[PDB]
Each structure stands twice: as structure tokens, then as C-alpha cells.
């Protein structure tokens, strides 16, 4: 995630295309977020 | 063909194609000209 | 780090005002992903002084 | 592209399956072919009208040229273009400031570049019309072209 | 589903109408909701051809080629659509409609036969003698023999292997407007019948402190159904030119006739009655529950504008209100949606010259009570 | 070798195996009064016949992605993977859509699927993708 932040964000700005592909891939693989933020896990950020 | 159609849709709303768009259409259309010539040469002799 | 990445993937203010379709939908995806109540709760738990 | 189509059409018997397939392709892309044919014949008629003398009647400025309004009414009086094509010709005109259109250069802009494609389109349609005759679909393209 | 697309030919999944032989008569259903319990099928001929009662959807039972061209002699299921009942072979009578629960291939399977003797189908010149599939029984009219039997033929259909003189039928498709309206009639009637059953389940039974007397009742579903039905029967806009608005008036008029002739009008009258018997939202909370009482005011109000939309602009539907003239005036003084009842009354009196004929002094006192 | 085409009537089905029973369901929705869509089983038609009047859908457009964006900013074709499509209900004449409501309790990200009165929004478009590498 630190590497991904360095890719997406630069000079206090968000690169639109990098942000778009990053969120598309992360959201494409739902198991990336962990036990929280997944319906099968049934837990949220608070529970985490 | 699909890539050229997508490029045309990208410029479909724009009033005037800028210089980079003109150069990129030139590249794609020249390559399409070469592909068309080779497809023609595969059948110019009457090879049934 | 996950939340910080999503915040750094959040679209720009001027883009969201101008109404870019992809920017609006990316912000919508982030909105659906991370519910607000979780954020205010995580801020509400304090440190160990 | 048209040359490649002609090469496919080489050595074709009457009512050959390749000719029938090409006709099916044309009638499946009917609207696009109609736009192409209209584009060619619109500027051919434009050259003819500019050469016509009634258009010279509507032309009044000493230095050549013609106002956009004069162009609109003159090309309406010839009664060969509809309203949309009239506006499209107005758009395609140079439209130099003060609505001055150099009709001579306007007519000759699309005469040479479109000649080679226009001739091959004519050859393609003639070749199809003579190698698959009695075709209900193809006479429409013949009449449009 | 459209494996074969042929114009002018019958296809699966196509609702239509079956005029037996002559154009005058067709395959019908019981007149009212309770006259034959919506089970006995008839051969009535007359104005019923326009109504939703004369309507059947041929669904190909064969899951292969579902909705494709109907081949000669193929198993398939007739559906009433309006009541959602599959016509089928029965044992106590010739053949009757059954629920989808009672619908099985051994009963609902029919097929279209070219000739009545043992040894594609076009909408025009059909002349097909339909026949059951699982059995050799043949659909024939009873021909009952005006005081002895009504002027309409009402020849109830019997499944019996005898070959009568005319077993041919004509398949004529109905309009998409008719099909859509009939499907609304079916779904809406089912929803409000279940709503009435809920009203009866907690009818007069105090809730106390626990859950209501019955199970949960659909409030939001009825809300959406009420709203889009009102919008469906919204009058034509005035700024339209003559031809548009006249044609839309004609379409609205016949749609109102279709919805009224299927007992929907009486259905919503029953709904508004059993919602009246809970005089206040507090009463609705006491018996049916506070959560259901949350939307009582809105449901009652939109019921009144639904009634007004159904009757407004049609003389026949509002002339039916002659018997229920006192019914409208009785609820006139009610505090909730008073403009609703009053608008309903206004439409009744303007469009019917007979309710005002039977208007009485006490009714006029009630109107002056509204003013006072 | 027939292909699906624009402006035809078509049904959407899914096969799922639950309790060692390979149920085949078809998506449907009455539309009026209940925008939400539910799937009824088309299997076991012999015992419980299905409902076909509200499960059928008409294709309207099979536009490409870039052309979709342009149409948003402003026949009888054939469908290809990567194209986004517009589906209209048969009885309802309402375009199928993805709604913002989330009555599906199971997953927070799971959104409700329901019919929409119009099609001017982008909510009624569905980009199909290949199932296998073939």
C-alpha cells in the first residue's frame, strides 16, 4: 500500500489515471481489503 | 479498426482535432494503408 | 495505509465540480466502500496518554 | 479499401457468392454508404452550381466572394439541396470574417483529393450492378450514386 | 426466446384472444370474482371481447424453444393472465382454470390440431381444433338451452372425447396496451387482496404491547402501486393539440373501462372501507401496529385520488356510483383527506346525471356541514 | 452459429447448485409497485410452472464504451464482448438498472438491482465481458 500511494499521489495531487486503474484493480479483487470491508467477512472498519 | 473507431469517438464531441490527434490519426491510417495493401496483394492474383 | 491510499485516490475538488463522469463514479465507489460512521468512530477512540 | 474489395471481386461469376456477400455487407452498412455517396455528389453538384450562371447572378461583390446569406438563398433557389445539406455546405465553407465565402476555392477544395476514391466507388458499384443484376437492394445504391 | 420471428403467425409467450369460430364469441372466464369463484370457464359472446376477461397467454410448456414458433400439436399452457390461472383439465368437470400450484403437465398441456380426425399455425385463418395432450378428451361447448339461460351463449367448455360440429378457434392478438393493462390488473389485484387479508388478520384484535395480530403487511409496496396507478390514469395534458389529446382521452377512457370491469373499483372501495374502520392513526397503532400506522394517512389519501382518477372522465364508472352515493357522502365529514372525498364526489356529480337525480335533503345537509 | 442481435426478446438465466440441486433461475421483476428484481426458478416446470411474462427483456442498444461516454455527454447490430448494453422490460417498458438502495443486508458493497423509469442516466448500461479465455 505504501508503494501504491507513492504511485497514485504526487506533489500534493492525485494522478487521475493511476488512481482510476488502482481503484479498479483493488475493487476487482475484493480480498485485498481484508476481513473488514467484505460481505463474507461481515465486519467493517470499526470492527477491525 | 476497433481502435480507430474508439479514437474517432474520443474526438466525436470535439470541434477541432488538435495537432497530436492529427499525428496519431496519420500513424494509424498509414499502418491501415499498409495492412490493406498486403491484404490486397494476398488476393490480387486470382487465388480462389 | 488502505484508507490513506483511498484518500490519495480520491478525485480532485475542481474535477468533481466540473462533473467528470469517471471522477464522480470513483468518488461514488469510495463512498460505498468506506462508510462515514466507521471514520467518526475510529477518530472517536483516543490515544493512551 | 475499395481496391481491396475490387480484388476480392476479381474472377467473379454472375451471382457469385462473393458478390452477394458484398451486397449484403453494403446493405448492412447502408447508412454509412449513403453518407459517403451524399458527400461526393454534394460537392459535385456544388461545382456544377458554382459554374452555373444563376449563382453568378447572386454573386455581387466586385472582388469575387459572396455573403453567407446570399449563398443560402442562391443555393436554395437552385432547389437541389435540402436544409440540412445547405447548412452543412455553409459549415464546410471557409466562412472568412464578414461572412465572405470564396466560392471558387470552396468548390475546388474537394475536387482533386476526392477524385481517386470517387472513381473507385463508381467502379465498385458498376462491377456489383453488372455481376449481380436483378437485385432489389442494389438499385437503391445505384440511384443514390 | 424469439427463435423464429414471423409476422402474422402465432408465437410462444404471446398473449392473445381465442374467438371460437365466429367473431362474436370467445373464450371467457367467470363474470365477477365470486360468481364462479374465478374457476369456471365459458364461451360467452358479446362485449366481453374488449374486456380483460377475454385474454389468454399461450406459454410453451416445452422449455426448449420457449417463446419460439408454436408447432402443430405441441404441449403448452393456457394462462388467464388477468387472474394468473393456468387453464387445465379437471376431474369434477370438463376443464377449469387452476392455480399455478395446481398446474402440472398432466392437466395444463394442450395442443393445436389441424383436423378433428386423427391424422406453421397462422394468426389469420387459424381454424384449429385444440385438444388436450395427456388425455384424448376434446374441448367442446355445452350449448345450454332468455329466461332459461342468458342471452349470451355462456356455453361452458367440457373436455370430452366427442367431436362436436365446431371445435375450431381463431387466434387474434391483442394490443400491447391491453396486455400491459391486464398484467397490471393481475398484479395490483393480488397485492390488494393480500392487503385486505392482512386487514382481516388484525381486524379488531388489539396489539397490546407485542407484535401486531397478523404478520407484516406491505405498506411501501402498496404506496408505489398507488402512485404509479395514479400516474397511469393521469388525464391528458391540456396544452396538447386536438388530435393528441382526443386520442389520449380515448385510450384513457378504455383503460378506465378495462380496470373498472375487473372489479378493481370495488376492490379499492373495500380497501378504503376497512381503512376507515380504524378512525385514527392512534387506532391503527393500537390494532395493526405503530409501524403500519405511520403511513395510514398517506395510504388513505392516495386511495381517494386513485378512485377519483378511475372514475373521472368516464360516465359509466361514475354512473355505477348511484348505489354507493350515500357511501361517498357518509365519509365526507372525515378529517383525513377531506379534499380527497370531496373531489371524488365532485367527479361523481359532474359526470353522472343520475346520482344528482337521487340526491336527497340529508345529503345536501351533509355538504352544508362541510361548508360549516 | 446464430448470434444475439439488437432489438430481440431475450431472458437472463443463472445456474446455481444449492443442497446438491442444480437450480436454474431466471431474473424478473414486475416493475410497477416493486422496482426491485428477483429471480424465479425456471427448473421444475412440471410441478411448479415458471412465470415468463415478466422475465423477458428486449435489447435496445449494444453501444461501445467510448460511444457510450459520448452519448452520455450529449439498426439491429450484433453484440461483442466489451460492449455495454441497454435492456428494456417487456411488460413494464422500463429500462433495467442498478439502484443506489442497498436492502441486501448480506454485503455492504452489494447494491440493489431494479428497473428504472427512463434511461437518460448511466445506471442502465452493462458492459459484458468474456467468461473463459477461449
UniProtKB/Swiss-Prot annotation, chain B:
Signal peptide: none annotated. Belongs to the ryanodine receptor (TC 1.A.3.1) family. RYR1 subfamily. Detected in skeletal muscle (at protein level). Fast- or slow-twitch skeletal muscle. It comes from the Eukaryota. Homotetramer. Can also form heterotetramers with RYR2. Identified in a complex composed of RYR1, PDE4D, PKA, FKBP1A and protein phosphatase 1 (PP1). Repeated very high-level exercise decreases interaction with PDE4D and protein phosphatase 1 (PP1). Interacts with CALM; CALM with bound calcium inhibits the RYR1 channel activity. Interacts with S100A1. Interacts with FKBP1A; this stabilizes the closed conformation of the channel. Interacts with CACNA1S; interaction with CACNA1S is important for activation of the RYR1 channel. Interacts with CACNB1. This is Ryanodine receptor 1. Binding of [3H]ryanodine indicates that the heterozygous channel is activated by Ca(2+) concentrations 4-fold lower than normal. Single-cell analysis of cotransfected cells shows a significantly increased resting cytoplasmic Ca(2+) level and a significantly reduced luminal Ca(2+) level. Cytosolic calcium-activated calcium channel that mediates the release of Ca(2+) from the sarcoplasmic reticulum into the cytosol and thereby plays a key role in triggering muscle contraction following depolarization of T-tubules. Repeated very high-level exercise increases the open probability of the channel and leads to Ca(2+) leaking into the cytoplasm. Can also mediate the release of Ca(2+) from intracellular stores in neurons, and may thereby promote prolonged Ca(2+) signaling in the brain. Required for normal embryonic development of muscle fibers and skeletal muscle. It is found in: Sarcoplasmic reticulum membrane. It comes from Oryctolagus cuniculus (Rabbit). Ca(2+) binds at residue 41. The chain holds residues 3927 to 3974 of 5037 of the full protein. The calcium release channel activity resides in the C-terminal region while the remaining part of the protein constitutes the 'foot' structure spanning the junctional gap between the sarcoplasmic reticulum (SR) and the T-tubule. Pore opening is mediated via the cytoplasmic calcium-binding domains that mediate a small rotation of the channel-forming transmembrane regions that then leads to channel opening. The N-terminus is blocked.
Swiss-Prot record, chain C:
Coiled coil: none annotated. Changing residue 34 to G: Impairs interaction with FKBP1A. Detected in skeletal muscle (at protein level). Fast- or slow-twitch skeletal muscle. It is found in: Sarcoplasmic reticulum membrane. The N-terminus is blocked. Channel activity is modulated by phosphorylation. Belongs to the ryanodine receptor (TC 1.A.3.1) family. RYR1 subfamily. The calcium release channel activity resides in the C-terminal region while the remaining part of the protein constitutes the 'foot' structure spanning the junctional gap between the sarcoplasmic reticulum (SR) and the T-tubule. Pore opening is mediated via the cytoplasmic calcium-binding domains that mediate a small rotation of the channel-forming transmembrane regions that then leads to channel opening. Homotetramer. Can also form heterotetramers with RYR2. Identified in a complex composed of RYR1, PDE4D, PKA, FKBP1A and protein phosphatase 1 (PP1). Repeated very high-level exercise decreases interaction with PDE4D and protein phosphatase 1 (PP1). Interacts with CALM; CALM with bound calcium inhibits the RYR1 channel activity. Interacts with S100A1. Interacts with FKBP1A; this stabilizes the closed conformation of the channel. Interacts with CACNA1S; interaction with CACNA1S is important for activation of the RYR1 channel. Interacts with CACNB1. Cytosolic calcium-activated calcium channel that mediates the release of Ca(2+) from the sarcoplasmic reticulum into the cytosol and thereby plays a key role in triggering muscle contraction following depolarization of T-tubules. Repeated very high-level exercise increases the open probability of the channel and leads to Ca(2+) leaking into the cytoplasm. Can also mediate the release of Ca(2+) from intracellular stores in neurons, and may thereby promote prolonged Ca(2+) signaling in the brain. Required for normal embryonic development of muscle fibers and skeletal muscle. Binding of [3H]ryanodine indicates that the heterozygous channel is activated by Ca(2+) concentrations 4-fold lower than normal. Single-cell analysis of cotransfected cells shows a significantly increased resting cytoplasmic Ca(2+) level and a significantly reduced luminal Ca(2+) level. This is Ryanodine receptor 1. It comes from Oryctolagus cuniculus. The gene is RYR1.
Amino acid at each position: 500500500l505504501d508503494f501504491l500511494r507513492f504511485a497514485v499521489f504526487v506533489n500534493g495531487e492525485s494522478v487521475e489515471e493511476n488512481a482510476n486503474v488502482v481503484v479498479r484493480l483493488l475493487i476487482r479483487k475484493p480480498e485485498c481489503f481484508g476481513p473488514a470491508l467484505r460481505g463474507e467477512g461481515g465486519s467493517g472498519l470499526l470492527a477491525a | 479498426q476497433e481502435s480507430i473507431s474508439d479514437f474517432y469517438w474520443y474526438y466525436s464531441g470535439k470541434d477541432v482535432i488538435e495537432e497530436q490527434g492529427k499525428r496519431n490519426f496519420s500513424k494509424a491510417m498509414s499502418v491501415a494503408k499498409q495492412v490493406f495493401n498486403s491484404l490486397t496483394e494476398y488476393i490480387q492474383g486470382p487465388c480462389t | 495505509a488502505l484508507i490513506d491510499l483511498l484518500g490519495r485516490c480520491a478525485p480532485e475538488m475542481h474535477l468533481i465540480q466540473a462533473g467528470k463522469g469517471e471522477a464522480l463514479r470513483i468518488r461514488a465507489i469510495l463512498r460505498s466502500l468506506v462508510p462515514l460512521d466507521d471514520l467518526v468512530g475510529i477518530i472517536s477512540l483516543p490515544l493512551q496518554i | 479499401m475499395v481496391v481491396m474489395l475490387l480484388s476480392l471481386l476479381e474472377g467473379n461469376v454472375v451471382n457469385g457468392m462473393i458478390a452477394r456477400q458484398m451486397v449484403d455487407m453494403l446493405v448492412e452498412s447502408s447508412s454509412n454508404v449513403e453518407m459517403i455517396l451524399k458527400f461526393f455528389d454534394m460537392f459535385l453538384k456544388l461545382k456544377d452550381i458554382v459554374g452555373s450562371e444563376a449563382f453568378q447572378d447572386y454573386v455581387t461583390d466586385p472582388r469575387g466572394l459572396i455573403s453567407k446569406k446570399d449563398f443560402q438563398k442562391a443555393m436554395d433557389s437552385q432547389k437541389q439541396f435540402t436544409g440540412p445539406e445547405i447548412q452543412f455546405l455553409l459549415s464546410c465553407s471557409e466562412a472568412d470574417e464578414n461572412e465572405m465565402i470564396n466560392f471558387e476555392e470552396f468548390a475546388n477544395r474537394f475536387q482533386e483529393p476526392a477524385r481517386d476514391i470517387g472513381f473507385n466507388v463508381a467502379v465498385l458499384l458498376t462491377n456489383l450492378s453488372e455481376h449481380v443484376p436483378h437485385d432489389p437492394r442494389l438499385r437503391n445504391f445505384l440511384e443514390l450514386a | 426466446i424469439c427463435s423464429c420471428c414471423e409476422e402474422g403467425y402465432v408465437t410462444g409467450g404471446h398473449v392473445l384472444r381465442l374467438f371460437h369460430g365466429h367473431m362474436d364469441e370467445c373464450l371467457t372466464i367467470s363474470a365477477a370474482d365470486s360468481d364462479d369463484q374465478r374457476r369456471l370457464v365459458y364461451y360467452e359472446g358479446g362485449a366481453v371481447c374488449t374486456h380483460a376477461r377475454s385474454l389468454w397467454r399461450l406459454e410453451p410448456l416445452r422449455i426448449s424453444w420457449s417463446g419460439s414458433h408454436l408447432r402443430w400439436g405441441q404441449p403448452l399452457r393456457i394462462r388467464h393472465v388477468t387472474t394468473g390461472r393456468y387453464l387445465a383439465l379437471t376431474e369434477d368437470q370438463g376443464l377449469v382454470v387452476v392455480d399455478a400450484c395446481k398446474a402440472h403437465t398432466k392437466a395444463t398441456s394442450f395442443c393445436f390440431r389441424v383436423s378433428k380426425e386423427k391424422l406453421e399455425i397462422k394468426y389469420g385463418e387459424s381454424l384449429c381444433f385444440v385438444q388436450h395432450v395427456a388425455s384424448g378428451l376434446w374441448l367442446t361447448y355445452a350449448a345450454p338451452d332468455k329466461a332459461l339461460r342468458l342471452g349470451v351463449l355462456k356455453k361452458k367448455a367440457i373436455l370430452h372425447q366427442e367431436g362436436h360440429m365446431d371445435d375450431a378457434l381463431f387466434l387474434t392478438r391483442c394490443q400491447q396496451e391491453e396486455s400491459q393493462a391486464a398484467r397490471m390488473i393481475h398484479s395490483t389485484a393480488g397485492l390488494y387482496n393480500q392487503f385486505i387479508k392482512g386487514l382481516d388478520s388484525f381486524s379488531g384484535k388489539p396489539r397490546g404491547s407485542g407484535p401486531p395480530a397478523g404478520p407484516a403487511l406491505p405498506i411501501e409496496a402498496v404506496i408505489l402501486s398507488l402512485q404509479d396507478l395514479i400516474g397511469y390514469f393521469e388525464p391528458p395534458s391540456e396544452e396538447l393539440q386536438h388530435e393528441e389529446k382526443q386520442s389520449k382521452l380515448r385510450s384513457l377512457r378504455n383503460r378506465q373501462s378495462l380496470f373498472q370491469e375487473e372489479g378493481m373499483l370495488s376492490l379499492v372501495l373495500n380497501c378504503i372501507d376497512r381503512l376507515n374502520v380504524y378512525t385514527t392513526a392512534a387506532h391503527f397503532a393500537e390494532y395493526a401496529g405503530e409501524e403500519a400506522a405511520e403511513s395510514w394517512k398517506e395510504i388513505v389519501n392516495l386511495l381517494y385520488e386513485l378512485l377519483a382518477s378511475l372514475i373521472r372522465g368516464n360516465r359509466a364508472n361514475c354512473a355505477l356510483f348511484s348505489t354507493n352515493l350515500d357511501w361517498v357522502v357518509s365519509k365526507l365529514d372525515r378529517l383525513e383527506a377531506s379534499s380527497g372525498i370531496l373531489e371524488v364526489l365532485y367527479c361523481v356529480l359532474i359526470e353522472s346525471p343520475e346520482v344528482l337525480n337521487i340526491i336527497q335533503e340529508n345529503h345536501i345537509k351533509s355538504i352544508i356541514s362541510l361548508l360549516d | 452459429v446464430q448470434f444475439l442481435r439488437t432489438d430481440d426478446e431475450v431472458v437472463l438465466q443463472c445456474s446455481a447448485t444449492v443442497l446438491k440441486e442444480q437450480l436454474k433461475l431466471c431474473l424478473a421483476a414486475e416493475g410497477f409497485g416493486n422496482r426491485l428484481c428477483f429471480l424465479e426458478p425456471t427448473s421444475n416446470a412440471q410441478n411448479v410452472p415458471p412465470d415468463l411474462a415478466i422475465c423477458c427483456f428486449t435489447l435496445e442498444q449494444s453501444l461501445s464504451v467510448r460511444a457510450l461516454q459520448e452519448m452520455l455527454a450529449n439498426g439491429h447490430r450484433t453484440l461483442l464482448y466489451g460492449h455495454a448494453i441497454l435492456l428494456r422490460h417487456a411488460h413494464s417498458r422500463m429500462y433495467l438498472s442498478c439502484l443506489t438502495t442497498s436492502r441486501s443486508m448480506t454485503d455492504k458493497l452489494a447494491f440493489d438491482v431494479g428497473l428504472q423509469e427512463d434511461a437518460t442516466g448511466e445506471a442502465c448500461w452493462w458492459t459484458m465481458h468474456p467468461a473463459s479465455k477461449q
